[PDB]
Amino acid sequence: GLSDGEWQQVLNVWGKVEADIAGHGQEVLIRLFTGHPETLEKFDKFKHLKTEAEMKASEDLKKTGTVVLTALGGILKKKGHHEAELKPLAQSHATKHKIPIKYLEFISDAIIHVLHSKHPGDFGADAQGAMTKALELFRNDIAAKYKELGFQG
């Protein structure tokens, strides 16, 4: 999917996320949830939050933030050689959580948003381009598995 120059960009940008996984993961989910509230309904432990302060105030959300971005970071470091770590991911989001691939689109957008926000001016045009394709690759490999399963919705 990507060139090596491009993976290079991806991994350079991921290095900013690794300096504060917890803080980045928090703001990614908050951006996802405040923007697309129907997404909050896919989590029974976040059902209760109703405001963004409460969200910001939840330590559990930070925890969930760290799990999601730790797992993502592990896939990105495989430079597209992720059949092994994505299958399980794809199977559980489809059969167990029942996550439409649109929500995966939404968080992909939420990551890009958050990176600009926390790093205004040092998330260059090339960087945005390498990162965007990486997330698209991710999402595409998941949609193929969703298709197998007929996870129609």
Dihedral of the CA atoms 27, 31, 37, 42 (nearest 10)? Answer: -50
Mark 38-67 with x for binding to ligand HEM (rule: CB under 6 A) and - for no binding: -x--xx-x---------------------x
Q: Which residue lies nearer to ligand HEM by CB, 95 or 117?
A: 95
**14 is an interface residue for ligand HEM by CB under 6 A:** no
Among 68, 80, 128, 136, binds ligand HEM (CB under 6 A): 68
- Tell me the Ramachandran region of residue 124: left when phi exceeds 0, alpha when psi lies from -120 to 50, beta otherwise: beta
Mark 83-122 with x for binding to ligand HEM (rule: CB under 6 A) and - for no binding: ------x--xx---x-x---xx--x---------------
Q: Which residue lies nearer to ligand HEM by CB, 4 or 62?
A: 62
Binding site residues, ligand HEM, CB under 6 A: 39, 42-43, 45, 67-68, 71-72, 89, 92-93, 97, 99, 103-104, 107
